[PDB]
């Protein structure tokens, strides 16, 4: 109040969340294609197998262990959720 004022950010938190949601939807529904040009749809297990192929693991490894991989992914996301809810010094 001594000539010290704060200007609001141009993009509101809702707009930042909208960008983040758009990025999530693009990644889930089209993989890395949308960042290079037009978005091309692809089933999520298939692009997951593409990622496995990109790290040096054959596609059959993912297809024959699909349920285990999905369970591990869900458990890891839940554990991150819990860790964020528990530890206040992470941020």
């Amino acid at each position: 109040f001594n000539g010290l004022t704060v200007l609001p950010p141009l993009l509101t938190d809702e707009m930042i969340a909208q960008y983040t949601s758009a990025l999530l939807a693009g990644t889930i529904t089209s993989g890395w294609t949308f960042g290079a040009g037009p978005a091309l749809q692809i089933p999520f297990p298939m692009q997951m197998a593409y990622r496995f192929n990109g790290i040096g693991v054959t596609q059959n490894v993912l297809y024959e262990n699909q349920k285990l991989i999905a369970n591990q992914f869900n458990s890891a996301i839940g554990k991150i959720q819990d860790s964020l809810s528990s530890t206040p010094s992470a941020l």
Binding site: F1, T5, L7, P8, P9, L10, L11, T12, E14, M15, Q18, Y19, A22, A25, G26, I28, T29, S30, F34, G37, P38, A39, L40, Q41, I42, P43, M46
Partner: protein
Amino acid sequence: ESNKKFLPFQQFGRDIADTTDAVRDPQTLEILDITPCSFGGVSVITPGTNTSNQVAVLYQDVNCTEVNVFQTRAGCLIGAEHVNNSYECDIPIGAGICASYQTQSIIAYTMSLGAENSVAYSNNSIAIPTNFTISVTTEILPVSMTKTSVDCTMYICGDSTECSNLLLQYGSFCTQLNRALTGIAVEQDKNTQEVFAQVKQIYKTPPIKDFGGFNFSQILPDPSKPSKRSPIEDLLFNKVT
């Protein structure tokens, strides 16, 4: 009038920043809060003067009652008409509000983040490109500054010996100023050398430009002109001044 609960002995309050926030009337036990008179910055929103001379004024951090009249989270906006539509941000006002000149008068609106899309996702469908395009884009990166040197002997004192004698009493401020400026000057040449001098030898294109149909005439150096620069380079050096 304030409801601050002073103790019977306290006379004037204060905030967390040690500022007089309240006072007690010497002739009445009433408690009066002190608030600064409303102030703020004044921002003027305008398109180019070649387009129109009409402007909009944004009063920052003040409600419109303390000053066609639109109240934004960034302050009170005067002269701009709020519009229910949404386009790309032309003139950023703040808090998701932008302004533009459209059919004509200045308008205020919430910016559009983009074009809505929904990739047709199913669990057994894939989209595959049947064609392609070759896209060439431009990226500009600053590489260096102008090397500037400043001498205290002539800057601080305009060829005056007494001033130089008095300046000599301040130690080695100017020696380290010159040292910093020389460091910057050498740094700039290091920047340029790091960027461009990345090639061991000077390679030359063959006299016959037969590259299978690909044509690099716009990027290869132009021999006809006295300056051996490509046409794109000539445009770049003409535009930048």
